Design brief:
The complex is a heterodimer. By secondary structure, chain A is mainly beta. Helix content of chain A is 0%, strand content 70%. Chain A contains no helices and 3 strands. The termini of chain A are far apart. In chain A, 35% of the residues are buried. Chain B is globular and about 35 Å long. Chain B has a two-stranded antiparallel sheet with strand order 1-2. The N and C termini of chain B lie close together (12 Å). Classes of the chains: A mainly beta, B alpha+beta. Chains A and B meet through β1, β2 and β3 of A and α1 and β2 of B.
Amino acid sequence: XXXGXXXXXXXXXXXXXXXXXXXXXXXXXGXXXXXXXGXXXXX
Amino acid sequence: GXXXXXXXGXXXXXXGXXXXXXXXXXGXXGXXXXXXXXXXXXXXXXXX
């Protein structure tokens, strides 16, 4: 019954930006994250 | 549980550069680098 996913996004890096997300799972796809921050704006 | 979106290319910019190299190892803003992402984004899934 699933057991995986996540996502989110945004990005940037040195340039600014932010967002985050993460997740993973899916029978050993691993992953992590669980946040990020900002920055902000965009959208 | 909803979601959607899509696109991005390069396996989602490499998962956003592996989430900024794991948040710079917990750098709280310090470090940095990256240089990608865009959209949009999205996702979803979930399950049992």
